[PDB]
Design an enzyme around this catalytic site. Structure first.
Site: not given
Lengths: 145, 144
Positions: B9, B45, B62, B88, B138
Protein backbone atom coordinates in the site's frame (compact mmCIF):
# COMPACT_ATOMS: atom_id res chain seq x y z
CA UNK A 1 -21.41 2.63 -9.76
CA UNK A 2 -18.43 1.99 -12.05
CA UNK A 3 -14.78 1.14 -11.46
CA UNK A 4 -12.83 3.86 -13.22
CA UNK A 5 -9.48 2.43 -12.20
CA UNK A 6 -7.87 -0.94 -12.82
CA UNK A 7 -5.09 -0.49 -10.26
CA UNK A 8 -2.27 1.78 -9.14
CA UNK A 9 0.02 1.58 -12.17
CA UNK A 10 3.11 2.97 -10.50
CA UNK A 11 4.48 5.17 -7.75
CA UNK A 12 6.93 7.78 -9.06
CA UNK A 13 10.14 8.45 -7.19
CA UNK A 14 12.40 11.38 -8.08
CA UNK A 15 16.17 11.22 -7.53
CA UNK A 16 19.46 12.62 -8.88
CA UNK A 17 20.66 9.41 -10.56
CA UNK A 18 18.18 6.97 -12.17
CA UNK A 19 20.73 4.32 -13.12
CA UNK A 20 22.06 4.34 -9.57
CA UNK A 21 18.59 3.92 -8.09
CA UNK A 22 18.05 0.91 -10.36
CA UNK A 23 21.31 -0.86 -9.52
CA UNK A 24 20.50 -0.31 -5.84
CA UNK A 25 16.95 -1.69 -6.15
CA UNK A 26 18.25 -4.72 -8.02
CA UNK A 27 21.22 -5.49 -5.76
CA UNK A 28 19.76 -4.49 -2.40
CA UNK A 29 16.02 -5.12 -2.77
CA UNK A 30 16.01 -7.84 -5.40
CA UNK A 31 13.69 -5.82 -7.62
CA UNK A 32 13.95 -5.90 -11.44
CA UNK A 33 14.36 -3.22 -14.10
CA UNK A 34 11.58 -3.70 -16.65
CA UNK A 35 12.06 -0.56 -18.69
CA UNK A 36 14.43 2.36 -19.13
CA UNK A 37 13.63 5.36 -21.31
CA UNK A 38 15.53 8.59 -21.86
CA UNK A 39 13.56 11.62 -22.99
CA UNK A 40 16.06 14.17 -24.41
CA UNK A 41 13.33 16.64 -25.32
CA UNK A 42 11.99 16.39 -21.76
CA UNK A 43 15.36 16.26 -20.02
CA UNK A 44 14.34 13.26 -17.95
CA UNK A 45 15.30 9.60 -17.69
CA UNK A 46 12.79 7.11 -16.30
CA UNK A 47 13.15 3.50 -15.19
CA UNK A 48 10.38 1.10 -14.21
CA UNK A 49 11.18 -1.30 -11.36
CA UNK A 50 9.11 -4.30 -10.19
CA UNK A 51 9.42 -6.77 -7.28
CA UNK A 52 9.29 -9.59 -9.84
CA UNK A 53 10.79 -10.38 -13.26
CA UNK A 54 7.33 -10.64 -14.80
CA UNK A 55 4.42 -8.33 -14.04
CA UNK A 56 1.13 -9.83 -12.91
CA UNK A 57 -2.14 -8.24 -14.06
CA UNK A 58 -2.37 -5.68 -11.25
CA UNK A 59 1.25 -5.43 -10.10
CA UNK A 60 2.16 -1.81 -9.28
CA UNK A 61 5.65 -0.73 -10.33
CA UNK A 62 8.08 1.87 -9.02
CA UNK A 63 9.06 4.54 -11.55
CA UNK A 64 12.41 6.17 -10.83
CA UNK A 65 12.85 9.61 -12.41
CA UNK A 66 16.06 11.64 -12.70
CA UNK A 67 17.14 14.96 -14.29
CA UNK A 68 19.15 15.28 -17.51
CA UNK A 69 19.35 19.07 -17.23
CA UNK A 70 18.40 21.82 -14.76
CA UNK A 71 15.32 22.73 -16.82
CA UNK A 72 13.50 19.42 -16.48
CA UNK A 73 10.46 19.14 -14.22
CA UNK A 74 12.26 16.67 -11.95
CA UNK A 75 15.21 19.01 -11.44
CA UNK A 76 12.91 21.89 -10.52
CA UNK A 77 11.07 19.57 -8.15
CA UNK A 78 14.29 18.41 -6.53
CA UNK A 79 15.25 22.08 -6.17
CA UNK A 80 11.92 22.80 -4.47
CA UNK A 81 12.81 20.15 -1.91
CA UNK A 82 16.43 21.28 -1.61
CA UNK A 83 17.85 18.11 -3.17
CA UNK A 84 15.57 15.82 -1.16
CA UNK A 85 14.79 12.75 -3.29
CA UNK A 86 11.42 11.13 -2.64
CA UNK A 87 7.94 10.13 -3.75
CA UNK A 88 6.75 12.40 -6.54
CA UNK A 89 3.32 11.08 -7.56
CA UNK A 90 0.93 8.17 -8.06
CA UNK A 91 -0.30 6.90 -11.41
CA UNK A 92 -3.59 5.04 -11.72
CA UNK A 93 -4.10 2.78 -14.74
CA UNK A 94 -7.31 3.24 -16.72
CA UNK A 95 -8.95 1.23 -19.50
CA UNK A 96 -10.26 4.27 -21.40
CA UNK A 97 -8.57 7.58 -20.60
CA UNK A 98 -11.15 9.50 -22.64
CA UNK A 99 -14.14 7.88 -20.96
CA UNK A 100 -12.64 8.19 -17.49
CA UNK A 101 -11.39 11.74 -18.13
CA UNK A 102 -14.92 12.70 -19.16
CA UNK A 103 -16.28 11.11 -15.98
CA UNK A 104 -13.80 12.91 -13.72
CA UNK A 105 -14.62 16.24 -15.37
CA UNK A 106 -18.31 15.69 -14.61
CA UNK A 107 -17.31 14.90 -11.03
CA UNK A 108 -15.62 18.28 -10.82
CA UNK A 109 -12.08 17.04 -11.32
CA UNK A 110 -9.77 19.25 -13.37
CA UNK A 111 -7.12 17.80 -15.66
CA UNK A 112 -3.68 19.15 -16.54
CA UNK A 113 -4.21 18.66 -20.30
CA UNK A 114 -7.35 19.04 -22.40
CA UNK A 115 -6.17 16.07 -24.44
CA UNK A 116 -4.03 13.08 -23.35
CA UNK A 117 -0.39 12.99 -24.40
CA UNK A 118 2.20 10.27 -25.00
CA UNK A 119 3.87 9.14 -21.78
CA UNK A 120 6.55 6.50 -21.17
CA UNK A 121 5.94 4.02 -23.97
CA UNK A 122 2.79 4.14 -26.06
CA UNK A 123 0.77 5.15 -23.00
CA UNK A 124 -1.70 8.00 -23.19
CA UNK A 125 -1.51 10.11 -20.02
CA UNK A 126 -2.86 13.13 -18.16
CA UNK A 127 -2.75 14.40 -14.57
CA UNK A 128 -5.22 15.81 -12.08
CA UNK A 129 -4.46 19.16 -10.48
CA UNK A 130 -2.79 18.62 -7.10
CA UNK A 131 -5.92 19.89 -5.32
CA UNK A 132 -7.99 17.35 -7.26
CA UNK A 133 -5.64 14.80 -5.75
CA UNK A 134 -6.21 16.23 -2.29
CA UNK A 135 -2.52 17.08 -2.00
CA UNK A 136 -1.22 14.23 -4.14
CA UNK A 137 -0.33 14.57 -7.81
CA UNK A 138 -2.30 11.77 -9.48
CA UNK A 139 -1.59 10.61 -13.00
CA UNK A 140 -3.96 8.78 -15.31
CA UNK A 141 -2.33 6.28 -17.66
CA UNK A 142 -3.66 3.89 -20.29
CA UNK A 143 -1.68 1.18 -22.05
CA UNK A 144 -1.91 0.90 -25.87
CA UNK A 145 -4.63 -1.20 -27.53
CA UNK B 1 15.63 -14.33 -5.68
CA UNK B 2 12.65 -12.07 -4.89
CA UNK B 3 12.32 -10.72 -1.36
CA UNK B 4 9.08 -8.83 -2.02
CA UNK B 5 5.60 -9.97 -3.03
CA UNK B 6 4.30 -6.57 -4.12
CA UNK B 7 3.81 -3.00 -2.97
CA UNK B 8 1.21 -3.58 -0.23
CA UNK B 9 0.00 0.00 0.00
CA UNK B 10 0.86 3.65 -0.39
CA UNK B 11 0.20 5.68 2.74
CA UNK B 12 -1.43 9.10 2.39
CA UNK B 13 -1.54 11.39 5.44
CA UNK B 14 -4.28 13.98 5.78
CA UNK B 15 -6.30 16.00 8.35
CA UNK B 16 -9.52 13.97 8.08
CA UNK B 17 -9.61 10.30 7.06
CA UNK B 18 -13.41 10.13 6.80
CA UNK B 19 -13.58 13.09 4.40
CA UNK B 20 -10.79 11.59 2.29
CA UNK B 21 -12.52 8.21 1.98
CA UNK B 22 -15.88 9.75 1.04
CA UNK B 23 -14.03 11.74 -1.61
CA UNK B 24 -12.28 8.66 -2.96
CA UNK B 25 -15.58 6.78 -3.21
CA UNK B 26 -17.77 9.61 -4.54
CA UNK B 27 -15.29 11.09 -7.01
CA UNK B 28 -12.95 8.21 -7.86
CA UNK B 29 -15.17 5.18 -7.47
CA UNK B 30 -12.63 3.58 -5.14
CA UNK B 31 -13.76 1.25 -2.35
CA UNK B 32 -13.25 1.48 1.42
CA UNK B 33 -12.24 -1.98 2.62
CA UNK B 34 -11.46 -1.42 6.30
CA UNK B 35 -11.32 1.33 8.91
CA UNK B 36 -9.27 1.21 12.10
CA UNK B 37 -8.85 3.66 14.96
CA UNK B 38 -6.00 3.39 17.47
CA UNK B 39 -6.62 5.71 20.47
CA UNK B 40 -3.19 5.14 22.01
CA UNK B 41 -1.28 6.05 18.85
CA UNK B 42 -3.94 8.68 18.18
CA UNK B 43 -4.41 7.58 14.57
CA UNK B 44 -7.26 6.63 12.26
CA UNK B 45 -6.42 4.50 9.22
CA UNK B 46 -8.61 3.56 6.26
CA UNK B 47 -7.67 1.07 3.55
CA UNK B 48 -8.90 1.99 0.05
CA UNK B 49 -8.83 -0.16 -3.10
CA UNK B 50 -9.69 0.59 -6.77
CA UNK B 51 -11.95 -2.48 -6.74
CA UNK B 52 -14.30 -3.99 -4.15
CA UNK B 53 -12.37 -7.27 -4.17
CA UNK B 54 -8.59 -7.36 -3.80
CA UNK B 55 -6.66 -9.45 -6.29
CA UNK B 56 -3.53 -11.17 -4.94
CA UNK B 57 -1.03 -8.38 -5.73
CA UNK B 58 -3.40 -5.42 -5.64
CA UNK B 59 -1.90 -2.36 -3.93
CA UNK B 60 -4.15 -0.27 -1.67
CA UNK B 61 -4.09 3.34 -0.50
CA UNK B 62 -3.86 3.74 3.24
CA UNK B 63 -5.43 6.99 4.40
CA UNK B 64 -3.96 8.21 7.69
CA UNK B 65 -5.35 10.98 9.90
CA UNK B 66 -4.68 12.20 13.48
CA UNK B 67 -7.01 11.80 16.46
CA UNK B 68 -5.16 14.60 18.28
CA UNK B 69 -2.25 17.05 18.00
CA UNK B 70 0.17 14.70 19.78
CA UNK B 71 -0.01 11.90 17.19
CA UNK B 72 2.88 11.21 14.82
CA UNK B 73 0.47 11.89 11.95
CA UNK B 74 -0.21 15.36 13.33
CA UNK B 75 3.52 16.01 13.69
CA UNK B 76 4.19 14.82 10.14
CA UNK B 77 1.46 17.17 8.96
CA UNK B 78 2.92 20.10 10.90
CA UNK B 79 6.34 19.13 9.55
CA UNK B 80 4.89 19.49 6.07
CA UNK B 81 3.18 22.84 6.60
CA UNK B 82 -0.24 21.26 6.97
CA UNK B 83 -0.10 19.89 3.42
CA UNK B 84 -1.70 16.44 3.08
CA UNK B 85 0.23 14.05 0.85
CA UNK B 86 2.09 10.79 0.29
CA UNK B 87 3.55 9.54 3.57
CA UNK B 88 5.25 6.24 2.73
CA UNK B 89 5.24 3.06 0.71
CA UNK B 90 4.85 -0.44 2.18
CA UNK B 91 6.10 -3.64 0.51
CA UNK B 92 4.56 -7.00 1.35
CA UNK B 93 6.72 -9.97 2.31
CA UNK B 94 6.09 -13.67 2.85
CA UNK B 95 8.44 -13.96 5.84
CA UNK B 96 9.38 -10.69 7.57
CA UNK B 97 12.04 -12.29 9.78
CA UNK B 98 13.75 -13.96 6.82
CA UNK B 99 13.70 -10.81 4.67
CA UNK B 100 14.85 -8.50 7.46
CA UNK B 101 17.92 -10.72 7.93
CA UNK B 102 18.76 -10.64 4.22
CA UNK B 103 18.35 -6.87 4.23
CA UNK B 104 20.63 -6.28 7.21
CA UNK B 105 23.13 -8.78 5.81
CA UNK B 106 23.20 -6.37 2.86
CA UNK B 107 23.81 -3.27 4.94
CA UNK B 108 20.23 -2.04 5.15
CA UNK B 109 19.32 -0.11 8.30
CA UNK B 110 15.99 -1.06 9.90
CA UNK B 111 14.12 1.20 12.34
CA UNK B 112 13.10 -1.55 14.76
CA UNK B 113 15.43 -4.26 16.06
CA UNK B 114 12.52 -6.70 16.05
CA UNK B 115 9.33 -6.66 13.91
CA UNK B 116 6.54 -4.57 15.43
CA UNK B 117 2.82 -5.19 15.43
CA UNK B 118 0.76 -2.92 13.19
CA UNK B 119 -2.90 -2.66 12.21
CA UNK B 120 -4.69 -5.84 11.18
CA UNK B 121 -2.26 -7.99 13.11
CA UNK B 122 0.56 -7.43 10.64
CA UNK B 123 4.18 -7.70 11.66
CA UNK B 124 6.06 -4.70 10.28
CA UNK B 125 9.28 -2.71 10.24
CA UNK B 126 10.74 0.25 8.36
CA UNK B 127 13.95 1.09 6.55
CA UNK B 128 15.82 4.25 7.49
CA UNK B 129 15.33 7.02 4.89
CA UNK B 130 18.95 6.46 3.82
CA UNK B 131 18.11 2.80 3.25
CA UNK B 132 15.04 3.69 1.21
CA UNK B 133 17.20 6.54 -0.07
CA UNK B 134 14.65 9.33 0.34
CA UNK B 135 11.32 7.61 0.82
CA UNK B 136 10.14 5.81 3.95
CA UNK B 137 9.77 2.17 3.01
CA UNK B 138 7.78 -0.15 5.21
CA UNK B 139 8.03 -3.95 5.33
CA UNK B 140 4.83 -5.82 6.13
CA UNK B 141 3.94 -9.48 6.59
CA UNK B 142 0.36 -10.71 6.80
CA UNK B 143 -0.72 -12.88 9.74
CA UNK B 144 -2.09 -16.28 8.69
Amino acid sequence: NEDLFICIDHVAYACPDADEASKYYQETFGWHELHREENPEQGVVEIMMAPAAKLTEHMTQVQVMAPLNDESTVAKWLAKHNGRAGLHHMAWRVDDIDAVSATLRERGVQLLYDEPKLGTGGNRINFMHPKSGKGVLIELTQYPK
